[PDB]
């Protein structure tokens, strides 16, 4: 006997501004770091970039009408900081705020709850030029000025807010792997920037309690729960290391305002622990979120990694299955294929039980409500004549994950909502357009924008039925 | 690269009053529940009981001398409630207090730190007759008066205190398995007595803050850290259930004053959750301890257990290897042999890395310092000509666990001390004398009581060398 989904459960779908909007230089928008980075040769697949994307900026009315036809309860999107502050911290661009105002008005006139993400990786280039963006404490008050601008303009109409989207990804990809802007490969700088971003998160949650006292706010963590390979004691110790180093390192700061000690000590032994200023711990501890945002796609299984062992691994960027290789931290852990689950063509594990495990771990450790801000299947889709897209593979992935959400609710996890990634097809940051996540197919590829026409996939009508039945019929 | 053991590390050894004292009816001592229970035919192996035990009540001066020869930094013992209040709640027995006063003075005169355990399973039978002992809230104030009596008399000379020793054991064994007094097999009663034992723990820590403000106090938990069998999502979920149900169920109450929610909801669905009164949560949350005491022997590996599957299982008290059977909770988890560690002949796991894992889990979840209150190997010992007991098996077990402690200290876990189990051979609760744990052999077996003479085992000289080198030579 499963509990039903609660009556106001937020059945949602999501996007991110750079991936969807286009209009990269219109109506006074400034350069973001992704505008510049994606135009550097070799940074993105086939040189794809966000100049046009799927042109949601001009076509948002059509898109919102499709959300209404689906019956979406909530739509999660991000605000492009460079539309609001073209130089990051000077005068406000009213035309930029006016777009999100038009968008929010369209959502509310169709009965859709907006979920506003403050930051989805697109800090204005001018802040990078001025002081190195997230690597400088100057960004704390600059991010706060931007957040409060949005809180005052939209707080009357937006109850749910997300601060930093996947801080662990944009910080580690931007400063450890050099795959995202600023393209840096330096663990010391990575953890310095990470600490500053923690302070920025805490500062804007504090501001939120003043400006939107009736709202709900949280960060959105990119959560891959760790498994040990087996019961070998060295592999369980690897799992202890991996879950602390990869997940607690962020979620403990979010929930408790404290870094975990074993990870901190290991970083200290390497001269990598961040610089802490007077007042830092007090700010971080006093910034309790209303929920933990969870972006979930897969679990990760780990095993013992000797001190001379695996470091950076090969990432599957192409869609050719079986090409990923182990990555880890020498002396602590390394990843290994989970032999008890299947994987997508990009070698991502398909593990819906893992979502129940992840939701259970967050409840058990932090006692926080969870808003699932991203979950989805990225796959090639074929457009069949008749504008038909039979994505049963996507339906099956979403179905099994939503099922495990309900088992987690029945366990007692307070889950506020579920945002499928993504509503329409959109630009992937590094992999172009072919790896599609949408309920709504967008007619374009890596070579041509074609006509960008929207085509409802089979999963569109499946999710429409899920929402109509509040998830009783999956 | 290992950190050294801290300079004031409490190198210790441990006992429990009923198991070593004897003198069961001297100097006004009242009857405990174990005095009554062990005399029931069939409860204990060959009818062994604690009338005499190893006669430490009469031979403590000899015993402390062997401690001082070894150079113990600490000795952990329990105070017998029924020597101090023969009736549980009546008049104090100055002769009972006098014995513990003489013992502490003996320890202090030889430079040994006393660690006093308040409760090790021997509630006075009178309290059990009057109101069911741990099933009644009356035991909270009677245990508090007992505790406060010892605090007022010994607080000046005793810094380290342990409240309830292995509360999960005497609750489970006494109210679910019927193996210990009161010999009950009723899960509803088990969790009611458990909740009351939690309130008693919290009340005496609150008293300790007033009567011994310069002292350190904590409960001691019998901690078997759980492992998933493999990276099967269904087995990892079983491990989540098991670690929360078997370990967080107690340690979260000790550290945070809250039961875990998923476990609570599972018992609620069964009608098994305890009765809560106004003021309970506030009391439990206000009793933060200075450390977590840890009795460690083995880890447990678990796997998926279908809703109709394994329930209570077969224990192995005979010593014939392989006779244990899986136990578990249908729907949640069942145990399984860990194929990557060896076991004793009682099917206990030999897993020194499991101690590091467990120490790391407590620091990571609670950020508490840890006092290892009990760890040891039980085995048959042969007395060979020349008063030689070559217990190389015991040395090897203790060596590897001590080595893993050092690694946990090097990881950043604050370990306050280590009390091997046990100092002298002692009476086991149910299986007599032949499964020996001591550094000091005691001359008696199951049939022949002999003269109880003390004999130094090979492990006595090993551990003497550990202490004098502060763990540098293992």
Coordinates of N, CA, C and O in Angstrom, one line a residue, chain A residues 63-196:
Chain A
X63 N 5.8 27.7 -26.3 CA 6.2 26.7 -25.3 C 5.3 26.7 -24.1 O 5.0 25.6 -23.6
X64 N 4.9 27.8 -23.6 CA 4.0 27.8 -22.4 C 2.7 27.2 -22.7 O 2.1 26.5 -21.9
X65 N 2.1 27.4 -23.9 CA 0.9 26.8 -24.3 C 1.0 25.3 -24.3 O 0.0 24.6 -24.1
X66 N 2.2 24.8 -24.7 CA 2.4 23.4 -24.7 C 2.5 22.8 -23.3 O 2.0 21.7 -23.0
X67 N 3.1 23.6 -22.4 CA 3.1 23.2 -21.0 C 1.6 23.1 -20.4 O 1.3 22.3 -19.6
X68 N 0.8 24.1 -20.9 CA -0.6 24.1 -20.4 C -1.4 22.9 -21.0 O -2.2 22.2 -20.3
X69 N -1.2 22.6 -22.3 CA -1.8 21.4 -22.9 C -1.3 20.1 -22.1 O -2.2 19.3 -21.8
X70 N -0.1 20.1 -21.7 CA 0.4 18.9 -20.9 C -0.2 19.0 -19.5 O -0.4 18.0 -18.8
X71 N -0.6 20.2 -19.0 CA -1.1 20.3 -17.7 C -0.1 20.4 -16.6 O -0.3 20.0 -15.5
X72 N 1.1 20.9 -17.0 CA 2.2 21.1 -16.0 C 1.8 21.8 -14.8 O 1.2 22.9 -14.9
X73 N 2.2 21.3 -13.6 CA 1.9 22.1 -12.4 C 3.0 23.1 -12.1 O 2.7 24.2 -11.5
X74 N 4.2 22.9 -12.5 CA 5.3 23.8 -12.3 C 6.3 23.8 -13.4 O 6.5 22.7 -14.1
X75 N 6.9 24.9 -13.7 CA 8.0 25.0 -14.7 C 9.2 25.6 -14.1 O 9.2 26.7 -13.6
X76 N 10.3 24.8 -14.1 CA 11.5 25.3 -13.5 C 12.4 25.9 -14.7 O 12.7 25.2 -15.6
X77 N 12.8 27.1 -14.5 CA 13.7 27.8 -15.5 C 14.8 28.6 -14.7 O 14.6 28.9 -13.6
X78 N 15.8 29.0 -15.4 CA 16.8 29.9 -14.8 C 16.7 31.3 -15.5 O 16.3 31.4 -16.6
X79 N 17.1 32.3 -14.7 CA 17.2 33.6 -15.2 C 18.7 33.9 -15.6 O 19.6 33.5 -14.9
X80 N 18.8 34.5 -16.8 CA 20.1 34.8 -17.4 C 20.6 36.1 -16.7 O 20.1 37.2 -17.0
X81 N 21.6 36.0 -15.8 CA 22.1 37.2 -15.1 C 22.6 38.3 -16.1 O 22.3 39.5 -15.9
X82 N 23.1 37.9 -17.2 CA 23.6 38.9 -18.2 C 22.5 39.6 -18.9 O 22.7 40.7 -19.5
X83 N 21.2 39.1 -18.9 CA 20.1 40.0 -19.4 C 19.8 41.1 -18.4 O 19.3 42.1 -18.8
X84 N 19.9 40.8 -17.1 CA 19.5 41.7 -16.0 C 20.5 42.7 -15.7 O 20.3 43.9 -15.6
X85 N 21.8 42.2 -15.6 CA 23.0 43.1 -15.4 C 23.9 42.8 -16.6 O 24.7 41.8 -16.4
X86 N 23.9 43.5 -17.7 CA 24.8 43.1 -18.8 C 26.3 43.2 -18.4 O 27.0 42.4 -19.0
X87 N 26.7 44.1 -17.5 CA 28.0 44.1 -17.0 C 28.2 43.5 -15.7 O 29.2 43.7 -15.0
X88 N 27.2 42.7 -15.2 CA 27.2 42.0 -14.0 C 26.8 42.7 -12.7 O 26.1 42.2 -11.9
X89 N 27.2 44.0 -12.6 CA 27.0 44.7 -11.3 C 26.8 46.2 -11.4 O 26.8 46.9 -10.4
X90 N 26.5 46.7 -12.7 CA 26.2 48.1 -12.9 C 24.7 48.3 -12.8 O 24.0 47.9 -11.9
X91 N 24.2 49.0 -13.9 CA 22.8 49.4 -13.9 C 21.9 48.3 -14.5 O 22.4 47.5 -15.4
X92 N 20.7 48.2 -14.0 CA 19.8 47.1 -14.4 C 19.3 47.4 -15.9 O 19.0 48.5 -16.2
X93 N 19.2 46.3 -16.7 CA 18.6 46.3 -18.0 C 17.2 46.0 -17.9 O 16.8 44.8 -17.7
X94 N 16.3 47.0 -17.9 CA 14.9 46.7 -17.7 C 14.3 45.7 -18.7 O 13.4 44.9 -18.4
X95 N 14.7 45.8 -20.0 CA 14.2 44.9 -21.0 C 14.5 43.4 -20.6 O 13.7 42.5 -20.9
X96 N 15.7 43.2 -19.9 CA 15.9 41.8 -19.4 C 15.0 41.4 -18.3 O 14.4 40.3 -18.4
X97 N 14.7 42.2 -17.3 CA 13.7 41.8 -16.4 C 12.3 41.7 -17.0 O 11.5 40.8 -16.6
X98 N 12.1 42.5 -18.1 CA 10.7 42.4 -18.7 C 10.5 41.1 -19.4 O 9.3 40.6 -19.4
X99 N 11.5 40.5 -19.9 CA 11.3 39.1 -20.5 C 10.8 38.1 -19.4 O 9.9 37.4 -19.6
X100 N 11.5 38.1 -18.3 CA 11.1 37.1 -17.3 C 9.8 37.5 -16.7 O 9.0 36.6 -16.3
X101 N 9.4 38.7 -16.6 CA 8.1 39.2 -16.2 C 7.0 38.7 -17.2 O 6.0 38.1 -16.7
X102 N 7.3 38.8 -18.5 CA 6.3 38.3 -19.5 C 6.2 36.8 -19.4 O 5.1 36.2 -19.5
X103 N 7.4 36.1 -19.1 CA 7.4 34.6 -19.0 C 6.6 34.2 -17.8 O 5.7 33.3 -17.9
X104 N 6.8 34.9 -16.7 CA 6.1 34.5 -15.4 C 4.6 34.8 -15.5 O 3.8 34.0 -15.0
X105 N 4.3 35.9 -16.2 CA 2.9 36.2 -16.4 C 2.2 35.1 -17.3 O 1.1 34.7 -17.0
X106 N 2.9 34.7 -18.3 CA 2.4 33.6 -19.2 C 2.2 32.3 -18.3 O 1.1 31.7 -18.5
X107 N 3.1 32.0 -17.5 CA 3.0 30.8 -16.7 C 1.8 30.9 -15.7 O 1.0 30.0 -15.6
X108 N 1.7 32.0 -15.0 CA 0.6 32.2 -14.0 C -0.7 32.3 -14.7 O -1.7 31.7 -14.1
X109 N -0.9 32.8 -15.9 CA -2.1 32.9 -16.6 C -2.6 31.5 -17.0 O -3.8 31.3 -17.4
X110 N -1.7 30.5 -17.1 CA -2.0 29.2 -17.4 C -2.0 28.2 -16.2 O -1.9 27.0 -16.4
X111 N -1.9 28.8 -15.0 CA -2.0 28.0 -13.8 C -0.7 27.2 -13.5 O -0.8 26.3 -12.7
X112 N 0.4 27.6 -14.0 CA 1.7 26.9 -13.8 C 2.5 27.7 -12.7 O 2.7 28.9 -12.8
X113 N 3.0 27.0 -11.7 CA 3.9 27.6 -10.7 C 5.3 27.8 -11.2 O 5.9 26.8 -11.7
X114 N 5.8 29.0 -11.2 CA 7.2 29.2 -11.6 C 8.1 28.7 -10.5 O 7.9 28.9 -9.4
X115 N 9.2 28.1 -10.9 CA 10.3 27.7 -10.0 C 11.6 28.4 -10.6 O 12.1 28.0 -11.7
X116 N 12.0 29.5 -10.0 CA 13.1 30.3 -10.5 C 14.4 29.8 -10.0 O 14.7 29.8 -8.8
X117 N 15.3 29.5 -10.9 CA 16.7 29.2 -10.6 C 17.5 30.5 -10.7 O 17.6 31.0 -11.8
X118 N 18.2 30.9 -9.7 CA 18.9 32.2 -9.8 C 20.2 32.0 -10.6 O 20.5 32.9 -11.4
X119 N 20.9 30.9 -10.5 CA 22.2 30.8 -11.2 C 22.3 29.4 -11.9 O 22.4 28.4 -11.2
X120 N 22.4 29.4 -13.2 CA 22.7 28.2 -13.9 C 23.8 28.4 -14.9 O 23.7 28.3 -16.1
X121 N 25.0 28.8 -14.3 CA 26.3 28.6 -14.8 C 26.8 29.8 -15.7 O 27.9 29.8 -16.2
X122 N 25.9 30.8 -15.9 CA 26.2 31.8 -16.9 C 26.5 33.2 -16.3 O 25.8 34.2 -16.6
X123 N 27.5 33.3 -15.4 CA 27.8 34.5 -14.8 C 28.3 35.5 -15.9 O 28.9 35.0 -16.9
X124 N 28.0 36.8 -15.8 CA 28.4 37.7 -16.9 C 29.9 37.7 -17.1 O 30.7 37.6 -16.1
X125 N 30.3 37.8 -18.3 CA 31.8 37.8 -18.7 C 32.4 39.0 -18.0 O 33.6 38.9 -17.6
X126 N 31.7 40.1 -17.8 CA 32.3 41.3 -17.2 C 32.8 41.0 -15.8 O 33.8 41.6 -15.4
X127 N 32.1 40.2 -15.0 CA 32.6 39.8 -13.7 C 33.8 38.9 -13.8 O 34.7 39.1 -12.9
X128 N 33.9 38.0 -14.7 CA 35.1 37.3 -15.0 C 36.3 38.2 -15.3 O 37.4 38.0 -14.8
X129 N 36.0 39.2 -16.2 CA 37.1 40.1 -16.5 C 37.5 41.0 -15.4 O 38.7 41.2 -15.2
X130 N 36.6 41.4 -14.5 CA 36.9 42.3 -13.5 C 37.7 41.7 -12.4 O 38.7 42.3 -11.9
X131 N 37.3 40.5 -11.9 CA 37.9 40.0 -10.7 C 37.9 38.4 -10.7 O 38.2 37.9 -9.7
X132 N 37.7 37.8 -11.9 CA 37.7 36.3 -11.9 C 36.4 35.7 -11.4 O 36.5 34.5 -11.0
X133 N 35.3 36.4 -11.4 CA 34.0 35.8 -11.0 C 34.0 35.0 -9.7 O 34.3 35.6 -8.6
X134 N 33.8 33.7 -9.8 CA 33.5 33.0 -8.5 C 34.8 32.8 -7.7 O 34.6 32.3 -6.5
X135 N 35.9 33.1 -8.2 CA 37.2 33.0 -7.5 C 37.4 34.2 -6.5 O 38.4 34.2 -5.8
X136 N 36.6 35.2 -6.6 CA 36.7 36.4 -5.8 C 35.6 36.6 -4.8 O 34.4 36.4 -5.2
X137 N 35.9 37.1 -3.6 CA 34.8 37.4 -2.7 C 33.9 38.6 -3.2 O 32.7 38.7 -2.7
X138 N 34.4 39.4 -4.2 CA 33.5 40.4 -4.7 C 32.2 39.9 -5.3 O 31.2 40.6 -5.3
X139 N 32.2 38.6 -5.7 CA 31.0 38.1 -6.3 C 29.9 37.8 -5.2 O 28.7 37.7 -5.6
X140 N 30.2 37.8 -4.0 CA 29.2 37.5 -2.9 C 28.2 38.6 -2.9 O 27.0 38.4 -3.0
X141 N 28.6 39.9 -2.9 CA 27.7 41.0 -2.9 C 27.1 41.3 -4.3 O 26.0 41.7 -4.4
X142 N 27.9 41.0 -5.3 CA 27.3 41.1 -6.7 C 26.2 40.1 -6.9 O 25.2 40.4 -7.5
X143 N 26.4 38.8 -6.5 CA 25.4 37.8 -6.6 C 24.2 38.2 -5.8 O 23.0 38.1 -6.3
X144 N 24.4 38.8 -4.6 CA 23.3 39.2 -3.7 C 22.5 40.4 -4.3 O 21.3 40.4 -4.2
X145 N 23.2 41.3 -5.0 CA 22.5 42.4 -5.6 C 21.6 41.9 -6.7 O 20.4 42.3 -6.8
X146 N 22.1 40.9 -7.5 CA 21.3 40.3 -8.5 C 20.1 39.5 -7.9 O 19.0 39.6 -8.4
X147 N 20.3 38.7 -6.9 CA 19.3 37.9 -6.3 C 18.2 38.8 -5.7 O 17.0 38.6 -6.0
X148 N 18.6 39.8 -5.0 CA 17.6 40.7 -4.4 C 16.8 41.4 -5.5 O 15.6 41.7 -5.3
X149 N 17.4 41.8 -6.6 CA 16.7 42.4 -7.7 C 15.6 41.5 -8.2 O 14.4 41.9 -8.4
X150 N 15.9 40.2 -8.3 CA 14.8 39.2 -8.7 C 13.8 39.0 -7.6 O 12.6 39.0 -7.9
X151 N 14.3 39.0 -6.3 CA 13.3 38.8 -5.2 C 12.3 40.0 -5.2 O 11.1 39.8 -4.9
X152 N 12.8 41.2 -5.4 CA 11.9 42.3 -5.3 C 10.9 42.4 -6.5 O 9.8 42.8 -6.3
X153 N 11.4 42.1 -7.6 CA 10.6 42.1 -8.8 C 9.6 41.0 -8.9 O 8.4 41.2 -9.3
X154 N 9.9 39.8 -8.5 CA 9.1 38.6 -8.7 C 8.7 37.9 -7.5 O 8.0 36.9 -7.6
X155 N 9.1 38.3 -6.3 CA 8.8 37.6 -5.1 C 7.3 37.5 -4.8 O 6.8 36.5 -4.2
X156 N 6.5 38.4 -5.3 CA 5.1 38.4 -5.1 C 4.4 37.3 -5.9 O 3.3 36.9 -5.6
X157 N 5.1 36.8 -6.9 CA 4.5 35.8 -7.9 C 5.3 34.5 -7.9 O 4.8 33.5 -8.5
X158 N 6.4 34.4 -7.3 CA 7.2 33.2 -7.3 C 7.5 32.7 -5.8 O 8.0 33.5 -5.0
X159 N 7.0 31.5 -5.5 CA 7.2 31.0 -4.2 C 8.4 30.1 -4.1 O 9.1 30.1 -3.0
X160 N 8.8 29.4 -5.1 CA 9.8 28.4 -5.1 C 11.1 28.9 -5.8 O 11.0 29.3 -7.0
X161 N 12.2 29.0 -5.1 CA 13.4 29.5 -5.7 C 14.6 28.6 -5.5 O 14.6 27.9 -4.5
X162 N 15.5 28.5 -6.5 CA 16.7 27.7 -6.4 C 17.9 28.6 -6.5 O 17.9 29.5 -7.3
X163 N 18.9 28.4 -5.6 CA 20.0 29.3 -5.6 C 21.0 29.0 -6.7 O 21.0 29.5 -7.8
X164 N 22.0 28.1 -6.3 CA 23.0 27.6 -7.2 C 22.6 26.3 -7.8 O 22.2 25.4 -7.0
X165 N 22.6 26.2 -9.1 CA 22.3 24.9 -9.7 C 23.6 24.1 -9.9 O 24.4 24.5 -10.7
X166 N 23.7 22.9 -9.2 CA 24.8 22.0 -9.4 C 26.1 22.7 -9.3 O 27.0 22.7 -10.1
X167 N 26.3 23.4 -8.1 CA 27.5 24.0 -7.8 C 28.7 23.1 -7.9 O 29.8 23.5 -8.4
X168 N 28.5 21.8 -7.5 CA 29.6 20.8 -7.6 C 30.0 20.6 -9.1 O 31.2 20.3 -9.4
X169 N 29.1 20.8 -10.0 CA 29.5 20.6 -11.4 C 30.1 21.9 -12.0 O 31.2 21.8 -12.6
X170 N 29.5 23.0 -11.8 CA 30.1 24.2 -12.5 C 31.4 24.6 -11.9 O 32.3 25.0 -12.6
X171 N 31.6 24.3 -10.6 CA 32.9 24.6 -9.9 C 33.9 23.5 -10.3 O 35.1 23.9 -10.6
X172 N 33.6 22.2 -10.3 CA 34.6 21.2 -10.6 C 34.9 21.2 -12.1 O 36.1 21.1 -12.4
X173 N 33.9 21.4 -12.9 CA 34.2 21.4 -14.4 C 34.9 22.7 -14.8 O 35.6 22.7 -15.7
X174 N 34.7 23.8 -14.0 CA 35.3 25.1 -14.4 C 36.7 25.2 -13.9 O 37.5 25.9 -14.5
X175 N 37.0 24.5 -12.8 CA 38.3 24.8 -12.1 C 39.1 23.5 -11.9 O 40.3 23.7 -11.6
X176 N 38.6 22.3 -12.0 CA 39.4 21.1 -11.8 C 39.5 20.3 -13.1 O 40.7 19.9 -13.5
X177 N 38.5 20.2 -13.9 CA 38.6 19.5 -15.2 C 38.8 20.4 -16.4 O 39.1 20.0 -17.5
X178 N 38.6 21.7 -16.2 CA 38.8 22.7 -17.3 C 37.8 22.5 -18.5 O 38.2 23.0 -19.6
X179 N 36.7 21.9 -18.3 CA 35.7 21.6 -19.4 C 34.7 22.7 -19.5 O 34.0 22.8 -20.5
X180 N 34.5 23.5 -18.5 CA 33.6 24.6 -18.4 C 34.4 25.9 -18.1 O 35.5 25.9 -17.6
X181 N 33.8 27.1 -18.4 CA 34.5 28.3 -18.1 C 34.8 28.4 -16.6 O 33.9 28.0 -15.8
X182 N 36.0 28.9 -16.1 CA 37.0 29.5 -17.0 C 38.0 28.6 -17.6 O 39.1 29.0 -18.1
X183 N 37.8 27.3 -17.6 CA 38.7 26.3 -18.2 C 39.9 26.1 -17.4 O 41.0 25.8 -18.1
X184 N 39.9 26.1 -16.1 CA 41.0 26.0 -15.3 C 41.2 24.5 -14.8 O 40.2 23.8 -14.5
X185 N 42.4 24.1 -14.6 CA 42.7 22.7 -14.1 C 43.6 22.9 -12.9 O 44.8 22.8 -13.0
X186 N 43.0 23.2 -11.7 CA 43.8 23.6 -10.5 C 42.9 23.3 -9.3 O 42.0 24.1 -9.0
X187 N 43.3 22.2 -8.5 CA 42.4 21.8 -7.4 C 42.4 22.9 -6.3 O 41.4 23.1 -5.7
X188 N 43.5 23.5 -6.1 CA 43.5 24.6 -5.0 C 42.6 25.7 -5.4 O 41.8 26.1 -4.5
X189 N 42.6 26.2 -6.6 CA 41.7 27.2 -7.0 C 40.2 26.7 -7.0 O 39.3 27.5 -6.6
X190 N 40.0 25.5 -7.4 CA 38.7 24.9 -7.4 C 38.1 25.0 -6.0 O 36.9 25.4 -5.9
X191 N 38.8 24.6 -4.9 CA 38.2 24.6 -3.6 C 38.1 26.1 -3.0 O 37.2 26.3 -2.2
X192 N 38.9 27.0 -3.5 CA 38.7 28.4 -3.1 C 37.5 29.0 -3.7 O 36.7 29.6 -3.0
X193 N 37.3 28.8 -5.0 CA 36.1 29.2 -5.7 C 34.8 28.5 -5.1 O 33.8 29.1 -4.9
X194 N 35.0 27.2 -4.7 CA 33.9 26.5 -4.1 C 33.4 27.1 -2.8 O 32.2 27.2 -2.5
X195 N 34.4 27.5 -2.0 CA 34.1 28.1 -0.7 C 33.4 29.5 -0.9 O 32.5 29.8 -0.2
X196 N 33.9 30.3 -1.9 CA 33.2 31.6 -2.1 C 31.8 31.3 -2.6 O 30.9 32.1 -2.2

